[PDB]
Amino acid sequence: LKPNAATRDQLNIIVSYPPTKQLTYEEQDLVWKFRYYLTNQEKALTKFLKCVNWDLPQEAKQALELLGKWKPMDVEDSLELLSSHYTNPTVRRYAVARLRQADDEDLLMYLLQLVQALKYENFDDIKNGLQDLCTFLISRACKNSTLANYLYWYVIVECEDQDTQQRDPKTHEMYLNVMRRFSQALLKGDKSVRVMRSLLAAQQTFVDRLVHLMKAVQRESGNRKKKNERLQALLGDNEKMNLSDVELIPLPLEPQVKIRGIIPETATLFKSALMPAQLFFKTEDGGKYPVIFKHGDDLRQDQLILQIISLMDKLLRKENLDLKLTPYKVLATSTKHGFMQFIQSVPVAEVLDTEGSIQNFFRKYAPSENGPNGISAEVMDTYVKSCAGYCVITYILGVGDRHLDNLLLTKTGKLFHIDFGYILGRDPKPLPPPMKLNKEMVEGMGGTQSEQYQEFRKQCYTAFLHLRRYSNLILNLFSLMVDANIPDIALEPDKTVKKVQDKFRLDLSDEEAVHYMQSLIDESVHAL
Ligand SMILES: CC(C)[C@@H]1CNC(=O)c2cc(N3CCOC[C@H]3C)nn21
C-alpha cells in the first residue's frame, strides 16, 4: 500500500516516461502493485491505464473504479487516451470529459489531431447518432464559429480522401457520418448556428468555383503570361465565375477574416511546376489578404507542420519567449487543393543572388550607424531570435530539403522556413545532418565571432528546454497522427513518434540537454 524510497524513485521514473514508451512487464506489475498509492499523482494515471488488461472484465472494472478515484490528469494529458491504444469506452469518455475543460483556443490547437482520432472511436455510435469524441467536437463547434470552420474543412478533407475510400471504406463512411452528424447539429440549433451552416455551405461553393477556375486556367496550353491573363480575365468576370464579388463569407484559411471576393488584376501564377496561384482577397474592412491557392497538390503534410509550429510558437510565448516566428496558416480544402497564408518575404537564395549576403540585405533595408555591423539592433534581435526558434523547431521535427529557396527573410529581420515536404528525418540527399544550419544564416548575424552568435545559442537552449517540458503534449499529438495519410508518417507509422521523441533527448537533464544542444549547434557550424 506504500512503497519505499527505491521503489518511489523507480515509480517516479516510470511516471516520467514519454507517452508512447512501452512499459515492461515488471513496470506494469509495479504500477499495478502501487496503484492505490499512485492515485494521488495525476501524472501516474496514464501509466496505470497503460498497464491494465482491458480484455479481462474484472480487471477493467477495477481499473475503471480507480479511474473515478484518481486525481484527474491534466487536460492536455487526456489526448493519450484517444489514441489507437484505448478501446474501452469509459476510458475514451473520460478523455473527452477532460477535454471538455479546455478552452476553445486550446481545443483548436488539438483539433486537427482529434479529427484523426475519430478513426479510433465506435463507428456504430457515430452512425446511430443520426459524450463521445464526435458528439463533443460537434457540440463545441456549434458554440464557436472558428471551431466549426476548422471542423468542417478537416472532416470534408477526410470525406474526399480517395485513399481512405479504397483502403478503409468503413473509416471513409464514418467521416461521411461525422459530416452528416455535424450538418444535423447545425440545422437543429438556433439562428446563430443555422447561420453557421449556411456560411459553411457558402464557403464550399466559393472554393468549388475557385477550383473550377484553376482547372480552366490550366486547360490553356499557353505560356505563363497568357495564363495569368486568363486567370485575371476569369476572376474579373463575376457573372460566370462569381469570385470577384460575393456576399461576405469567412475566409476558410482564417475565418476571423471575412472576404468579399478576389482582386482580379493582381492574381498571378507562381513560376513552378504546379503553377499555384497568388490571390489577394478583398477583406470585409477594405483590406487585402494574400494567399497561395494550390491545386492538384496535397497540402496535408504542410498543414500538420504549420499547425505544430503554431502550437510550438504558442507554447514558447506562454513561457514568455516570443522568438518572432512566422507560423503562417495552412488549410487543405481537399486532398488535392488548399490555401496558404502568404507572407511578404524574400528567399535567402534570392538575397544572396542580388545582395550577396544577408548582412548586405539588412544594411540596405534596415541601416543603423551604431547598430550591430551597421544594422538596426531591433532587426538583428529579431533575426537572432527567429533563427534560434526555427533552428530548434526544424531540428525537433526533422525537417529536410533545407535549401536556400526554403528559407525566407523579411525586412524586419524575421527568418522562417517553408515547404515541409520532407520531415521526420527524411531528406532528398543521404546522411542528412541531425541539425541543418547553413553558412549564410550564421553569417547573417555576423559570424561565429559576433556577440549575436552566442545570443543565438542562448535562445536555442531556452527554446529547447521549454519545448522539452511540453514533450508529452507534442508527442501525444503526433501519436494521434500515426495512421494519417501524411507521406512521411505513413511511410513508417510505428516509428513516427519515436523520431520526434529522440530529438528531445529526454534521457538528459536540463543541464546535459543544454550542453548537448550547444555541442549540436557548434558541430553543425564547424562543418559550416
Ligand atoms: C511556390 C510556393 C508554393 C512556395 C513553395 N512551397 C510552399 O509550400 C510555399 C510556401 C511559401 N510561403 C510564401 C510566403 O508566405 C508564406 C508561404 C505561403 N511559398 N512556397
Q: Is the CB of 262 under 6 A from ligand 1?
A: no
Instruction: Report yes or no: 314 and 389 within 8 Å, Cβ to Cβ.
Output: no
Convert 157-174 to b/e letters by CB count within 10 Å (16 or more is b).
bbbbbeebbeeeeebbbb
State if residue 327 touches ligand 1 by the CB under 6 angstroms criterion.
Answer: no
Vertex 377 angle, CA 371 and 379, to 5°:
125
Q: Which atom of ligand 1 is nearest to the CA of 418?
A: 10
DSSP letters, 43-98, are GGHHHHHHH--TTSHHHHHHHHHHHHHSPPPPGGGGGGGGSTT---HHHHHHHHHH
116: buried, middle or exposed (CB in 10 Å: 19+, 13-18, 0-12)? buried
326 lines ligand 1 (CB under 6 A): no
CA within 13 Å, CB half, 207? 24
Q: Quick one: which of 379, 448, 367 has its CA closest to 415?
A: 379
Ligand 1 pocket: which of 343, 418, 422 to mutate (most atoms within 8 A of CB):
418
Span from the CA of 289 to the centroid of ligand 1 (angstroms): 15
Under 8 Å between Cβ of 46 and 479: no
Q: How far does Cα 418 stand from its chain's mean position?
A: 13
Q: Is 270 in the pocket of ligand 1 (CB under 6 A)?
A: yes
Cell triple for 272: 513552378
Question: In Å, what resolution does this model reach?
Answer: 1.7
Amino acid identity, position 182: F
C-alpha angle 228-229-235 in degrees, rounded to nearest 5: 90
- Strand locations in 327-406, DSSP E? 330-334, 337-341, 346-347
Q: Supply 185's cell numbers.
A: 447539429
CA-272 nearest atom, ligand 1? 1
Alpha-carbon distances of 196 from 144, 145, 182, 240, 417, rounded to whole Å: 9, 7, 11, 26, 34
Q: Is 419 in the pocket of ligand 1 (CB under 6 A)?
A: yes
Long-range contacts from 432-438, C-beta under 8 angstroms, 24+ separation: 432/400, 433/524, 433/527, 434/395, 434/520, 435/391, 435/395, 435/520, 435/521, 435/524, 436/394, 436/395, 436/399, 436/400, 436/402, 436/524, 437/391, 437/521, 437/524, 437/525, 438/402, 438/404, 438/407
What is the atom index within ligand 1 of the atom nearest the CA of 416? Answer: 16
- Residue 90 C-alpha cell reads as 469509459
Question: Are 450 and 372 in contact, with CB atoms under 8 Å apart?
Answer: yes
Which of these, 333, 296, 291, 292, lies nearest to 207 by C-alpha position?
A: 333
User: Which method, experimentally, gave rise to this model?
Assistant: X-ray
Helix spans in 144-268 (H): 145-159, 162-167, 169-188, 191-219, 224-236
Nearest to 246 by CA among 213, 278, 283, 212: 283
Cα–Cα distance, 321 to 328 (Å, whole number): 18
Helices (H), 417-509: 439-444, 451-469, 471-479, 487-490, 496-503
d(CA 218, CA 269): 10
Asked if residues 319 and 346 have their Cβ atoms less than 8 Å apart, the reply is: no
Contacts of 322 (CB under 8 A, 6+ apart): 316, 385
φ, ψ (nearest 5 deg) of residue 346: -135, 135
User: Who's near 216: CB < 8 A, 6+ residues apart?
Assistant: 230, 234
- Determine contact, residues 521/436, Cβ cutoff 8 Å: no
Q: Is the CB of 342 under 6 A from ligand 1?
A: yes
Residue 292, ligand 1, Cβ within 6 A: yes
Ligand 1 binding pocket includes 276 (Cβ within 6 Å): yes
C-alpha 293: how far from its chain's center? 19
Sheet with 346-347: list strands edge to edge: 346-347, 407-409, 415-417
How many alpha carbons fall within 13 Å on the CB side of residue 185?
20
How far does Cα 297 stand from its chain's mean position? 18
Residue with CA at minimum distance from ligand 1 atom 17: 342
Distance between CA atoms of 180 and 165, rounded to whole angstroms?
17
Q: Cell numbers of 486, please?
A: 501524411
Q: Which helix (H) or strand (E) holds 402?
A: none
Backbone angles phi and psi of 466, in degrees to 5:
-65, -50
- Please identify, by atom number, the ligand 1 atom nearest to the C-alpha of residue 340: 18
Residues 6+ apart with CB under 8 A from 369: none
Sequence-separated (6 or more) residues with CB below 8 Å from residue 21? 501
Half-sphere exposure of 378 (CA within 13 A, CB side): 7
Angle between helices 133-142 and 169-188 (to 10 degrees): 40
